[PDB]
Every structure is written in structure tokens, then in C-alpha cells.
Swiss-Prot record, chain A:
Name of the protein in its database record: Alpha-sarcoglycan
Function, in words: Component of the sarcoglycan complex, a subcomplex of the dystrophin-glycoprotein complex which forms a link between the F-actin cytoskeleton and the extracellular matrix.
Localization (cell): Cell membrane, Sarcolemma; Cytoplasm, Cytoskeleton
Portion of the full sequence shown: 243 to 296 of 387
Source organism: Oryctolagus cuniculus
Subunit comment: Cross-link to form 2 major subcomplexes: one consisting of SGCB, SGCD and SGCG and the other consisting of SGCB and SGCD. The association between SGCB and SGCG is particularly strong while SGCA is loosely associated with the other sarcoglycans. Interacts with the syntrophin SNTA1.
Positions annotated with a glycan in the UniProt record: N4
Amino acid sequence: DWCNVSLVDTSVPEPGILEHDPFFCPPTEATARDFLADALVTLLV
Amino acid sequence: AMTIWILKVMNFTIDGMGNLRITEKGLKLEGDSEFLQPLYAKEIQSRP
Ligand SMILES: *[C@@H]1O[C@H](CO)[C@@H](O)[C@H](O)[C@H]1NC(C)=O
């Protein structure tokens, strides 16, 4: 059938990260103190 | 001397117990609050 003869040639058909930033959540930094020496002073006076 | 010790321990500034304030409803905390031991709760209903 010559009517459905198809010819095709070459053509030019030419058509991940994860991150979220919150603002802050710092813990108790510099965790050290004492309430004896000052108590000793104010109970030694 | 004992009363000055109380004022030094609890830090009774001009405006109440430091940043902490006590009102009719309950505690109003004008400072951060990090607890060393586990806390408890009943509800947490943030305001609209
Ligand atoms: C190609 O074949 C189909 C199916 O038989 C037909 O419908 C169509 O008419 C044909 N095309 C031509 C150009 O004859």
C-alpha cells in the first residue's frame, strides 16, 4: 500500500537537597556556679 | 542578715522575683526556663 508509506529522518528533540533553618534553641550554656562562699561571707559577718 | 540572705537568694529586685512575676491567674515568666528534671503537664493550649 503506497498510501501509508512513512518516511522518518533524524531530528533534534531536546527537552535534590533538604534544608530548613529555625531561629534559635540554645541550652544552658556555662553550667557551673556555687552558693557557699558568699553564704559564708554573709553568715561570717 | 537573714533577710538580706533571702533577698540575695531569691533576687528580690524592684519588680518582683527577678523576671518571674506572680499574678491572679498564675506564673508569668519574663525569662527563659530550662529545667534539669522532667516536668509534668495537663494540656498545652496555645492562644489563637
Ligand atoms: C492507513 O491505514 C489505515 C488503516 O487501514 C487507514 O484507515 C488509512 O486510511 C490509511 N492511510 C492512507 C493514506 O491510505
